[PDB]
Ligand binder design. Sequence first.
Ligand code: DJK
Ligand code: CL
Ligand code: CL
Length: 305
Amino acid sequence: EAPNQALLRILKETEFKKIKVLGSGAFGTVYKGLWIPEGEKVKIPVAIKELTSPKANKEILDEAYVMASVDNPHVCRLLGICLTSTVQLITQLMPFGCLLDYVREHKDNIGSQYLLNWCVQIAKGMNYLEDRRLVHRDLAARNVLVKTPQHVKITDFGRAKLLGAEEGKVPIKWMALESILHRIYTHQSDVWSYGVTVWELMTFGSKPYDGIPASEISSILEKGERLPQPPICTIDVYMIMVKCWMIDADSRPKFRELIIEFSKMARDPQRYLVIQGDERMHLPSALMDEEDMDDVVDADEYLIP
Ligand SMILES: */C=C\C(=O)Nc1ccc2ncnc(Nc3cccc(Br)c3)c2c1
Ligand SMILES: [Cl-]
Ligand SMILES: [Cl-]
């Protein structure tokens, strides 16, 4: 392979305010905050991710390695790490949260134009990863984030690996059949997970195979069962999802095809998704709460040599 020359930026804890908890888990916490780069006069809204103590540092560090290596408008990148205590990951804040929560909150206001655009943007992020030979291995709507309603990015590179390499809970309900049976993971298994992510969006946040248990799933899948057609979905859309779920991994769409197909559909959204009162809907895009925030710069506009 080629040398990875990404810069890992180390950030002093003095540099930022950990303004509030955003989320918490058995898996550690995520905070929102501000990062003021030393002597730069800019304020950058950020998310800070953290937390045995020695063996969780290793998992988190791998995530930083992958995150620091990616650069694309539809992938989240690491701004840097902070080395105090347990290691902290710093990234651009995505103010509207994850896409899964967002579709749940806004089902009434979400039009076909947006649903399809997200499908295009996610396929672009995934295609980028494939170009860099990354197999993500945890694609799901929970792991897609909303910068604005018009702009989403892929995240959560904790399970990521280079294609070919082999290196708690595994996401059964999003995984390709070969993955569940044989722990095989390719860009095409990511395609399968893409199918499920799209289904999650088209159902406005439904849980796939609600009620069923993970042990059950490889079995359901072997019989030939699949996720059902969502109400808003034309057969055109649903059949794209279905192709993402073929047994023959080489028979599934490539991410570059997914970009093309969804992109065509996004020209004529009302022809592919049927949504009641679709035309009326609008989603809102100051926004930065603090009073002295006119030195605020989004991370996308903050570039380093
Ligand atoms: C579905 C819940 C959720 O993901 N909430 C959330 C909201 C905003 C946000 N902004 C920036 N980053 C993240 N998550 C994240 C994932 C991996 C690494 C890092 Br540093 C941050 C969120 C998450
Ligand atoms: Cl699961
Ligand atoms: Cl729900």
